[PDB]
Ligand binder design. Structure first.
Ligand SMILES: C[C@@H]1O[C@@H](O)[C@@H](O)[C@H](O)[C@@H]1O
Ligand SMILES: C[C@@H]1O[C@@H](O)[C@@H](O)[C@H](O)[C@@H]1O
Ligand SMILES: C[C@@H]1O[C@H](O)[C@@H](O)[C@H](O)[C@@H]1O
Ligand SMILES: C[C@@H]1O[C@H](O)[C@@H](O)[C@H](O)[C@@H]1O
Ligand SMILES: C[C@@H]1O[C@H](O)[C@@H](O)[C@H](O)[C@@H]1O
Ligand SMILES: C[C@@H]1O[C@H](O)[C@@H](O)[C@H](O)[C@@H]1O
Lengths: 312, 312
């Protein structure tokens, strides 16, 4: 066995770095602690142990993460909720892990809410623009809320009517161009857009099993968007936009059918042009990933270490 | 969600009492603590909360339990292993929970070993005869070992060649008549017997999926024996002896197929003539039970409470 909490949420990020793609994955352990696992290039994963704790949150807390490069180094922000359901934030300032200011704002989240976050603009010469999405109530037909950081935290918009505790996918397809994916009350995955001056319902739409976990990534000038969703113990689905949307298809391995455990979640990251990883929770309890090798295809990759309890 | 540890082992006992059947179930929480849930007659289950901790063991520790009535009241013994894989025992002396003497004997157990225990003779006027079964190594072809309590703890016999960390079912079909069920290296469930003066291979045999969890109960003058086994996410199997063995059959509900989660365990209890409960771990993560109503049949019964973490 491992110390990976069953039905723990997952958050993942990655950036291209000289010497290879850098990846960081965040997950919760049996104690409610949020751990980090790291990967550089194709070398095996590291971390994921009790020495890799970056913070603590309520058990089964939702998770989201963003990153960008600044003058002080690599910036990372991890969002979660505490035992009182207060949206909280952990900060990696380029050299160490500390607690962010978001917690002091006192944003209350629905107990069964998921989280999603996106960022754009952040660089060595510019400040980041962060958006965090969450829900206030667990009831059916609830909307999605947004908190904005542009110098200080402030409430943003609210939109959509979703299934209870819907999965949420969020990606910045361009500077100031946002796309949010969630599951509507009719079980169809919908899209909300912000291109410059206002929010509006996007054209994307797809049928999915109730309660799927959702993730989204994007890159390029077109731009290209990939939306992923998965119901535990079912196969992973991918919708791809490359100027227009294709027909969603399954990503699977004939020799390893429905590898994820029931009621679990996924997370996806991307960097460069183009590397993609989709994480899921499997028997073990293990943290695994689907990896994309442009041109070739999808294959299940290396297992991420998630600790070993005492006595094993 | 709940505080029930995913893939936690389960132990269950029951006895007939004036005013209704009494049941106690033991399971592990996210912190490694062993909790107790109780049931009297047909009233809903109680306990299972952080206030119902009877002890602590390593995470994913195997469990076994026995009970009998004495002059000081209801006696219960719960077996588990600590973080150093030392077989340990919790004692309910009729009024309170304390630690047993078995731990001081220093019996080392294989990290992936399961546990089984049986008892006979214990009453208000006689001392009990307890037997605990376990394994020393996790390798294929390993044997089963026994520890004996008849005034003091001492090593017992060793027998069989099993699959790694085999499930173990043990029941006293009569005073001094023991039956142990385990899975042999060929995946067939086998039986070992002790009727009076020596151990010997029993006649029972059945094919099963590799790594099934096994439980066994017995009662009556015939006597009657029921052997249960289950692989997580598959259906429960039952072999019934009523003078001779029938053909193993599945116990299932057409409207709730394979209700257990993958890689989970079961436990069974019985009392009177005749009440039977088979516990399993389902989505939730919940502790559920199949209940037998003589003549009628099997049906999934009430859910056992296993706590609610803070923030939910
Ligand atoms: C980039 C594109 O922007 C709008 O046209 C949406 O309706 C599309 O679904 C896509 O998100
Ligand atoms: C009570 C019976 O005892 C022996 O005859 C075994 O071979 C049978 O399988 C059964 O356990
Ligand atoms: C960007 C930083 O990289 C380092 O290697 C890690 O140890 C830190 O936790 C953080 O992820
Ligand atoms: C971008 C800002 O960085 C700061 O360190 C944090 O404290 C704020 O909450 C926000 O994340
Ligand atoms: C026999 C005893 O019954 C009581 O009700 C319980 O509270 C104890 O834990 C024990 O099971
Ligand atoms: C029957 C005996 O009861 C005692 O209280 C325990 O300490 C022994 O280990 C054993 O279980």
């Amino acid at each position: 066995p491992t110390e990976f909490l069953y039905t723990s949420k997952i958050a993942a990020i990655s950036w291209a770095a000289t010497g290879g793609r850098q990846q960081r994955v965040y997950f919760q352990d049996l104690n409610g602690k949020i751990r980090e696992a790291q990967r550089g290039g194709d070398n095996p994963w590291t971390g994921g142990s009790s020495q890799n704790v970056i913070g603590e949150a309520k058990l089964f807390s939702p998770l989201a993460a963003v990153t960008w490069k600044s003058a002080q180094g690599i910036q990372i922000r991890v969002y979660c909720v505490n035992k009182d359901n207060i949206l909280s934030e952990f900060v990696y300032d380029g050299s160490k892990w500390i607690t962010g200011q978001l917690g002091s704002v006192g944003v209350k989240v629905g107990s069964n809410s998921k989280l999603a976050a996106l960022q754009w603009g952040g660089s060595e010469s510019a400040p980041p623009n962060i958006r965090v999405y969450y829900q206030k109530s667990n009831g059916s037909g609830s909307s999605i809320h947004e908190y904005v950081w542009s110098g200080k935290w402030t409430a943003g918009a609210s939109f959509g009517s979703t299934v209870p505790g819907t999965g949420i996918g969020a990606t910045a397809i361009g500077p100031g161009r946002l796309r949010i994916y969630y599951q509507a009350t009719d079980n169809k995955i919908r899209e909300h857009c912000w291109d410059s001056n206002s929010w509006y319902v996007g054209g994307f739409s797809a049928s999915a099993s109730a309660g799927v976990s959702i993730a989204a990534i994007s890159w390029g000038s077109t731009p290209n968007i990939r939306v992923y969703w998965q119901k535990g113990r079912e196969e992973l689905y991918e919708a791809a936009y490359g100027g227009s949307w294709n027909t969603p298809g399954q990503i699977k391995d004939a020799s390893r059918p429905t590898p994820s455990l029931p009621d679990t979640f996924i997370a996806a990251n991307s960097s460069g042009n183009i590397d993609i990883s989709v994480f899921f929770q499997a028997s073990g309890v293990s943290l695994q990933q689907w990896q994309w090798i442009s041109g070739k295809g999808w294959s299940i990759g290396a297992v991420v270490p998630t600790g070993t309890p005492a006595g094993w």
